[PDB]
Design a protein around this ligand. Structure first.
Ligand SMILES: [Ca+2]
Ligand SMILES: [Ca+2]
Lengths: 91, 374, 97
């Protein structure tokens, strides 16, 4: 079971590590029991008044989608090329 | 006369322009392009002729054409001279150039799309007539049918607006030919204390009989020409007449009639047949690009340039810029088959410069070739 | 006289052909090509080629350049090729206008 499971276990760990790292975005920097200070501060700020998931300006967003399309075209061209000079296609 | 454009529409693009007349010298416009706008002297110039007719190319043909042109121009710094009006193949090539510019991670190399358009065929020229240096003029980009007057292409970075000549309403093609000759006669510095010509090529897509005089004048000016296979018009006539091998008055007239029903006049058709026959009689400046079989635009450009210069002269020092362009495209096979074929004597001093640029630019195959060749 | 017609005659050799739909398509395309040059008549041969998934014959004989294909003419055959799970003809029609 170890020999046949290790790889899928590692992939699952990477997926879980994503969520674990995302959990720290809203997590206060103070550990318990000092986290009561952070909880009170946030509650008071809410009552009185991220690296991930960012919105970009229109120009940069268009540039990035154009770059993505160019990279996809390169990927497809490389796939079709490595298919075209394969041994079976040559035969 | 100099100005700037703030294109309003799909994308906000900043473009410049110059208003010129048929009386101005091309050298002044070249100096403006080099200095006043910061455009470095290119390693390749590709002129676009035709493609403004009612019938546009098939989507696959124009896509493969634009992709091949942009990929061949990105290895070096090249100008793609177009008719800077947003319609048809010019619009598609401008869009491809803009896409390459946006997707490029290296800004040192630049593919510049320069538009040479008449003043009397532009939408809303009065809007840009002011061109305040402090506040650039704003231009709305409108898509239009074939019509008779177009709008400036937004994706074209720079423009050269030619003013209509009262004597003859054909100053646009005349100025295009004059500029093609002038850049073809430039000698940019090569490495250190070296003189390198600028290779200048003309590509024809779906030509019309009206541009035969301009095409012949570019043939006279030693400008190699490249012909698309399935372009549709004069390109089909030229490729058929090349495949047949022998062109006569009857064949040329019959093909012109079959492709162009409209032309029915003894003098006009006779002049067009004479132009076709003489252009084919040149021959060595003419090349056929068939994307269904070629699939490599840089290869056919290199072959056309090598054939043109090989017919021009035999000395090694003239193949220097074709060899540099082959180095930039990593076309070692063509270099050893056509340039290093034994018909040309290569010394060590001649090969030293190209050795230096091949060694600097990460081209091991050419390093090995130059070590093997002296 | 039958041989003098010729263009309406096709030979199927199963020892060498091994594809009856291919030779039927070729015979129909040749017959209609001799009949007329307009694109609107190749419409049913093109539909039959779509149904048989003969993209090679369609691009070699129908989309050969001798016939001018517009967008309105290709719209219907595009619709039936897209509905009937024929991606190759979808790509061909997108590439042809
Ligand atoms: Ca030369
Ligand atoms: Ca029919």
């Amino acid at each position: 079971t170890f020999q046949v499971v290790q790889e899928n276990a590692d992939i699952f760990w990477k997926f879980q590590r994503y969520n674990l790292i995302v959990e720290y975005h809203s997590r206060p920097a103070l550990a318990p029991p000092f986290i009561i200070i952070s909880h009170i501060t946030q509650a008071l700020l809410s009552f009185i008044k991220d690296l991930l998931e960012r919105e970009l300006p229109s120009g940069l967003d268009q540039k990035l989608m154009t770059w993505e399309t160019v990279q996809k075209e390169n990927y497809l061209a490389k796939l079709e090329h490595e298919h075209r000079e394969s041994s079976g296609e040559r035969l | 006369r100099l100005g700037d454009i703030d294109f309003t529409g799909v994308s906000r693009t900043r473009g410049k322009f110059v208003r010129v007349t048929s009386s101005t010298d091309p050298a002044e416009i070249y100096q403006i392009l080099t200095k006043q706008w910061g455009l470095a002297p290119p390693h390749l110039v590709v002129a676009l002729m035709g493609g403004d007719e009612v019938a546009q190319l098939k989507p696959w043909l124009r896509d493969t054409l634009r992709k091949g042109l942009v990929k061949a121009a990105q290895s070096t710094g090249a100008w793609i001279l177009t008719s800077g009006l947003r319609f048809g193949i010019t619009k598609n090539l401008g869009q491809a150039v803009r896409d390459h510019s946006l997707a490029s991670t290296s800004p040192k190399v630049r593919v510049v799309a320069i538009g040479i358009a008449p003043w009397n065929m532009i939408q809303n020229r009065d809007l840009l007539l002011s061109a305040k240096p402090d506040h650039p003029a704003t231009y709305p980009t409108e898509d239009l049918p074939y019509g008779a007057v177009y709008s400036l292409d937004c994706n074209h970075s720079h423009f050269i607006l030619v003013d209509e000549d009262p004597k003859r309403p054909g100053a646009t093609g005349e100025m295009r030919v004059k500029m093609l000759k002038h850049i073809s006669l430039q000698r940019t510095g090569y490495g250190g204390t070296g003189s390198i010509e600028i290779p200048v090529l003309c590509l024809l897509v779906h030509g019309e009989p009206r541009i035969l005089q301009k095409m012949y004048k570019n043939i006279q000016n030693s400008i190699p020409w490249l012909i698309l296979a399935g372009s549709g018009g004069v390109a089909d006539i030229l490729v058929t007449l090349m495949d047949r091998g022998c062109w006569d008055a009857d064949i040329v007239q019959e093909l012109l009639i079959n492709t162009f029903p409209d032309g029915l006049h003894s003098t006009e058709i006779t002049s067009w047949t004479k132009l076709i026959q003489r252009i084919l009689d040149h021959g060595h400046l003419l090349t056929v690009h068939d994307p269904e079989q070629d699939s490599e635009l840089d290869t056919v450009i290199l072959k056309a340039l090598v054939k043109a210069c090989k017919s021009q002269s035999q000395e090694a020092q003239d193949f220097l810029d074709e060899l540099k362009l082959a180095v930039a495209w990593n076309r070692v096979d063509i270099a050893k088959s056509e340039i290093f074929s034994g018909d040309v004597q290569w010394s060590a001093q001649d090969l030293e410069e190209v050795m230096m640029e091949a060694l600097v630019n990460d081209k091991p195959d050419f390093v090995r070739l130059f070590v093997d060749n002296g």
